[PDB]
Swiss-Prot record, chains A, B:
It is linked to Chromosomal aberrations involving BCL6 are a cause of B-cell non-Hodgkin lymphomas (B-cell NHL), including diffuse large B-cell lymphoma and follicular lymphoma. Approximately 40% of diffuse large B-cell lymphomas and 5 to 10% of follicular lymphomas are associated with chromosomal translocations that deregulate expression of BCL6 by juxtaposing heterologous promoters to the BCL6 coding domain. Translocation t(3;14)(q27;q32). Translocation t(3;22)(q27;q11) with immunoglobulin gene regions. Translocation t(3;7)(q27;p12) with IKZF1 gene 5'non-coding region. Phosphorylated by ATM in response to genotoxic stress. Phosphorylation induces its degradation by ubiquitin/proteasome pathway. Polyubiquitinated. Polyubiquitinated by SCF(FBXO11), leading to its degradation by the proteasome. Ubiquitinated by the SCF(FBXL17) complex, leading to its degradation by the proteasome: ubiquitination by the SCF(FBXL17) complex takes place when aberrant BTB domain dimers are formed. The BTB domain mediates homodimerization. Its dimer interface mediates peptide binding such as to corepressors BCOR and NCOR2. Interaction with corepressors through the BTB domain is needed to facilitate the rapid proliferation and survival of GC B-cells but is not involved in the T(FH) formation and BCL6-mediated suppression of T(H)2 and T(H)17 differentiationrequired for GC formation. Induction: Down-regulated during maturation of dendritic cells by selective stimuli such as bacterial lipopolysaccharides (LPS), CD40LG and zymosan. Protein levels decreases upon genotoxic stress in a dose- and time-dependent way. Residues 26-93 form the BTB domain. It is found in: Nucleus. It comes from Homo sapiens (Human). This is B-cell lymphoma 6 protein. It comes from the Eukaryota. Expressed in germinal center T- and B-cells and in primary immature dendritic cells. Homodimer. Interacts (via BTB domain) with the corepressors BCOR, NCOR1 and SMRT/NCOR2; the interactions are direct. Forms preferably ternary complexes with BCOR and SMRT/NCOR2 on target gene promoters but, on enhancer elements, interacts with SMRT/NCOR2 and HDAC3 to repress proximal gene expression. Interacts with histone deacetylases HDAC2, HDAC5 and HDAC9 (via the catalytic domain). Interacts with ZBTB7 and BCL6B. Interacts with SCF(FBXO11) complex; the interaction is independent of phosphorylation and promotes ubiquitination. Transcriptional repressor mainly required for germinal center (GC) formation and antibody affinity maturation which has different mechanisms of action specific to the lineage and biological functions. Forms complexes with different corepressors and histone deacetylases to repress the transcriptional expression of different subsets of target genes. Represses its target genes by binding directly to the DNA sequence 5'-TTCCTAGAA-3' (BCL6-binding site) or indirectly by repressing the transcriptional activity of transcription factors.
């Protein structure tokens, strides 16, 4: 059968984060109140139920700008976008509520579950 | 410090392969003689020294069609494209030479090294 490369997926994600850092082939800007964040739609869809539901629809597939809900905390979004590209989630007592509320809105079930475990273990 | 999600990178790659299977946001067609393969440029760049060198150049960044070297075996390319999206490499005695020659051309150093180990262990 097939040879499994145990570090390939992480190596791919690291290189996709390098492309995001250099703004290479980013195709969308996410507006979160006064802040803006560029990303790859494919990565957003891969991590979020919300972005999946948006860009999978042929009507919204080619949008270059997504205006998020004005109540969404930009810091919460920033932390989650970095999570999407790194597999690392920066949860603190100062940000737990903002991050969890953002993850619920973005429909990132695994992150929501982790936020629940963080509260439980606090 | 940050919470590490050990399965996140693999979950992202699986979802990117699902998008490729549905032709969602694929932005390039790779022509390999009589065969054609659609892909996401970001994933190709993330896995291959060749595609990285091509699309990182502003002159070639927006190409929608890449005509590979006519001597490249389409089966070899097909196997490697599936590798890029799955972390699984299908090496057999019948394909080892074709896969290794393709990986060398695509500048996929880790795959070339694995092909060398396959020959060594044969
Ligand atoms: C069989 C099958 C079913 C689905 C929904 N697939 C799927 N394909 C492709 C992508 Cl990009 C994707 N994204 C995605 C959707 C929803 C959610 C997340 C990511 C994280 C989360 O919490 N919810 N999901 N594949
Ligand atoms: C610091 C630093 C240096 C580089 C070259 N970085 C980098 N950033 C982004 C991408 Cl997409 C990328 N791809 C890539 C390039 C070459 C090769 C492979 C993938 C596989 C292989 O065998 N060779 N490489 N980052």
């Amino acid at each position: 059968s097939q040879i499994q490369f145990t570090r390939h997926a992480s190596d791919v994600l690291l290189n996709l984060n390098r492309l995001r850092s250099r703004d290479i082939l980013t195709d969308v800007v996410i507006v979160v109140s006064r802040e803006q964040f560029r990303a790859h739609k494919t990565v957003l869809m891969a991590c979020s139920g919300l972005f999946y539901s948006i860009f999978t629809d042929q009507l919204k597939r080619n949008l270059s700008v997504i205006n998020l809900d004005p109540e969404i905390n930009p810091e919460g979004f920033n932390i989650l976008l970095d999570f999407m590209y790194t597999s690392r989630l920066n949860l603190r007592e100062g940000n737990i509520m903002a991050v969890m509320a953002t993850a619920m809105y973005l429909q990132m079930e695994h992150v929501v579950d982790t936020c629940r475990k963080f509260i439980k273990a606090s």
